């Protein structure tokens, strides 16, 4: 089913804002799709004078599970070997937004 919560791939080109930093293209993965559990927002009935969070809500979002941090080094036309980092998703699923 092409409409389930899946892990996709794409490319981005990385270059430091400052510095005649040299260029480099790398491969990235994101999460995209629809989850089967619907959302709801049911009200809470309270007797206390001071009210509180008026609604008890629930919502599932396709969110990452496993990430491996990576480091990538470029040349910015200078002595400094600037290193950039990101998180490599290795798996994605549904979880409560306000878990």
């Amino acid at each position: 089913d092409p409409r389930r919560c899946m892990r996709h791939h794409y490319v981005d080109s990385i270059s430091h804002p400052l510095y005649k930093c040299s260029s480099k293209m790398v491969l990235l993965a994101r999460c995209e799709g629809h989850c089967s559990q619907a959302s709801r927002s049911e009200p809470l009935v309270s007797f206390s004078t001071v009210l509180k969070q008026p609604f008890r809500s629930s919502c599932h979002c396709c969110r990452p599970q496993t990430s491996k941090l990576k480091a990538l080094r470029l040349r910015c036309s200078g002595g400094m070997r600037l290193t950039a980092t990101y998180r490599y998703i290795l798996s994605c699923h549904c979880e409560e937004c306000n878990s």
């Binding site: 791939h9 490319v11 080109s13 491969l27 496993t66 798996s91």
Partner: protein, 731 residues
């Protein structure tokens, strides 16, 4: 699970980081991702992946792999990502990746691939990303590249491609990213980018292009273009004509010389433009259509005018640097609301009018240094409220307004010589950094955290010239004594027509020199008595004018004259123990020299401008004739002691002799501190404070002048008391 691996995860076996030399066995057959990177596998045998029929991602980077069997990658029909970077594949395995129709991403960078077989990339009907950088490719594989109509990313960078032939990419209708930087490309054919209608990024940085490429007129979707670090020198008129969606252009590090007038016009998506070094450009570029610029930089050109409709046409500008040009008239900047930084240094701006800078709310940094500006009205300074930096240096300013600048945090006004007025200290309360044309101008900000640049010390005080209440009482006494003494002494000598001996004669010279100096000390004292506790507005007028020269000639003429004069009396006694005629001619020549020596520095630059006393050698900041006055007081003093050693080697004469010895001993004794203080940097003089030196210099430099006028008077009453009884008769 198996021994050397994690096998832990959602069917994601990771065994990277171990020393495995072959594909492990015993793993599930439902593994969908295997990461065995960074191991010692050098060869893949036939049918090496028959236990993982459902594998989708395979990582083999970092191994020493150099041989792939044609049938090694058999049965992997679900493989989508294959990484083979950092290996030793001498050629692209064309017969090993044939059965990978589901493949989408392939990495072949960092290998030693130098040949692309013509049968490669045949069977990959779903390829999207391809890496071919960090290799030894000398040409573009045009034919193999004509088998992948679905390719989206391609990187052919860090290789050795020399030229691109015709119709190289005439079959890639879905490419979005193309990298060709860090190559030796120096020629591009006309029909080389045909068919790239979806291309958005183009990178040709770090190549050897000699002429601007005319082949870029074929990419309507192009958005980012970079050709920096090339050898492009001329940009033709009307270049970016077929690229209306451009948003970023990099063209720095090029020996640009000429840029066409109608070249950057009609670009509504461009947000920045930095041009530097265009030596042969003398007209402002046309920008009818480019109205979304946020930073404009044009420096190093021959632009002498600025269109009056620069700001009106475009309202997006934040920074502007029109420095290193021939601009002399500034159009009204009314209209650039969002403008914040203006750099206009190194130009020919001569005036500032009322309406030049009216209507700049966001202006924060202004730079007007080295423009030769001399007239500034009392306007064009109120409309700009939030202004912190105001750099107006090395100009020709004569009067600086102080209205609407109360919010400054850093001011630079160092270099002007015609601004002798005092800046009000109440209008720069918020100011924190200050630089001023004259030293005495710091007496007003740093009292009388700013940390002004001149940094006035003892050599430049703000309240008391002389200093404490002891040195003031000491100089009043010298003036009151010396002046009285020398006067009567000389009046007595030049009284009797009776023939005047030279000893007695030379004695007249010492009194004359003392009178000369007393006049200097008196000038200094008078000068000290007129300005008490207020040595701020009387400092600049005194050091950049005629007073100092006269004083420095009455000091130099008197000091040098005495020494010179003190040098002839000793010789006279030595010669006595006829010549009377010669002796008069010798005295006239010393005064002339003294006059020359005195008048010499009165012509060169930087002297009589180191301390408010106009000392001959204050702070020793003239190491010539100031250091030549020291040389005179020294070698002269030395030769003078020799005649005394001689009188020692073998009545009145004894008295004279005694009187002259007391005088030289006294002069020699009194001249030691002045020479001593001159050679400070050599020995560092235990870091003498600039105030004791002044006190010593002030105390000791005129100290001998007060001795001869009275000491030989009463102390030497041999022929001197004779003449006293003489005038006593004159009573």
């Amino acid at each position: 699970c198996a021994a050397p691996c994690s096998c832990d995860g959602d069917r994601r076996v990771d065994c990277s980081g171990k020393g495995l030399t072959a594909v492990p066995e015993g793993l599930s057959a439902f593994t969908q991702a295997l990461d065995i990177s960074m191991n010692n596998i050098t060869q893949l045998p036939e049918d090496a992946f028959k236990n993982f029929p459902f594998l989708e991602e395979l990582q083999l980077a970092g191994n020493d792999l150099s041989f792939i069997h044609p049938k090694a990658l058999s049965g992997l029909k679900e493989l989508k990502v294959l990484t083979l970077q950092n290996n030793q594949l001498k050629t692209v395995p064309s017969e090993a990746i044939r059965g990978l129709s589901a493949l989408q991403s392939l990495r072949l960078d960092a290998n030693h691939i130098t040949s692309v077989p013509e049968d490669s990339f045949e069977g990959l009907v779903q390829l999207r990303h391809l890496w071919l950088d960090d290799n030894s490719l000398t040409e573009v594989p045009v034919h193999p590249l004509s088998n992948l109509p679905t390719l989206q990313a391609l990187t052919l960078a860090l290789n050795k491609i020399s030229s691109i032939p015709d119709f190289a990419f005439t079959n890639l209708s879905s490419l979005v990213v193309l990298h060709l930087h860090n190559n030796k490309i120096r020629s591009l054919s006309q029909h080389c980018f045909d068919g790239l209608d979806n291309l958005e990024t183009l990178d040709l940085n770090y190549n050897n292009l000699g002429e601007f490429p005319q082949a870029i007129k074929a990419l309507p979707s192009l958005k980012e273009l970079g050709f920096h670090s090339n050898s492009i020198s001329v940009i033709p008129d009307g270049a970016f004509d077929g690229n209306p969606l451009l948003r970023t252009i990099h063209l720095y590090d090029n020996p640009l010389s000429f840029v066409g007038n109608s070249a950057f016009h009609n670009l509504s998506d461009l947000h920045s433009l930095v041009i530097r070094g265009a030596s042969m450009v003398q007209q402002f570029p046309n920008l009818t259509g480019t109205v979304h610029l946020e930073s404009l930089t044009l420096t190093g050109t021959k632009i002498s005018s600025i269109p009056n409709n620069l700001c009106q046409e475009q309202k997006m500008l934040r920074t502007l640097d029109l420095s290193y040009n021939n601009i002399r008239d500034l159009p009204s900047f009314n209209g650039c609301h969002a403008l914040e930084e203006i750099s206009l240094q190194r130009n020919q701006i001569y005036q500032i009018k009322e309406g030049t800078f009216q209507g700049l709310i966001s202006l924060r940094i202004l730079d007007l240094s080295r423009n030769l500006i001399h007239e500034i009205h009392s306007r064009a300074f109120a409309t700009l409220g939030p202004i912190t930096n105001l750099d107006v240096s090395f100009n020709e300013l004569t009067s600086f307004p102080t209205e609407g600048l109360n919010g400054l945090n850093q001011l630079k006004l160092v270099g002007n010589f015609k601004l002798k007025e005092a800046l009000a200290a109440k209008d720069f309360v918020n100011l924190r950094s200050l630089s001023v044309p004259y030293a005495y101008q710091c007496c007003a900000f740093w009292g009388c955290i700013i940390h002004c640049t001149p940094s006035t010390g003892a050599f430049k005080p703000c309240e008391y010239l002389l200093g404490s209440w002891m040195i003031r009482l000491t100089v009043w006494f010298i003036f009151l004594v010396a002046l009285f003494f020398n006067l009567l002494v000389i009046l007595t000598t030049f009284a009797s027509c009776t023939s005047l001996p030279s000893s007695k004669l030379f004695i007249g010279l010492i009194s004359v020199s003392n009178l000369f100096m007393g006049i200097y000390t008196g000038i200094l004292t008078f000068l000290d008595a007129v300005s008490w506790g207020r040595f701020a507005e009387f400092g600049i007028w005194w050091e950049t004018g005629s007073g100092c020269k006269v004083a420095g000639f009455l000091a130099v003429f008197s000091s040098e004259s005495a020494i010179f004069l003190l040098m002839l009396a000793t010789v006279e006694r030595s010669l006595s123990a006829n010549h009377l005629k010669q002796f008069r001619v010798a005295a006239l020549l010393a005064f002339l020299g003294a006059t020359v020596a005195g008048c010499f520095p009165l012509f060169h630059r930087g002297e009589y401008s180191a301390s408010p006393l106009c000392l001959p050698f204050p702070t020793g900041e003239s190491l010539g004739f100031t250091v030549t006055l020291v040389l005179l007081n020294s070698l002269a003093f030395l030769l003078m002691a020799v005649i005394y050693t001689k009188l020692y080697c073998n009545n009145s004469q004894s008295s004279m002799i005694k009187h002259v010895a007391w005088l030289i001993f006294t002069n020699c004794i009194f001249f030691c501190p002045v020479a001593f203080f001159s050679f400070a940097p050599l020995i560092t003089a235990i870091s003498i404070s600039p105030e004791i030196m002044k006190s010593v210099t002030l105390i000791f430099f005129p100290l001998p002048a007060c001795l001869n006028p009275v000491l030989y008077v009463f102390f030497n009453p041999k022929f001197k008391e004779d003449w006293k009884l003489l005038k006593r008769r004159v009573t």
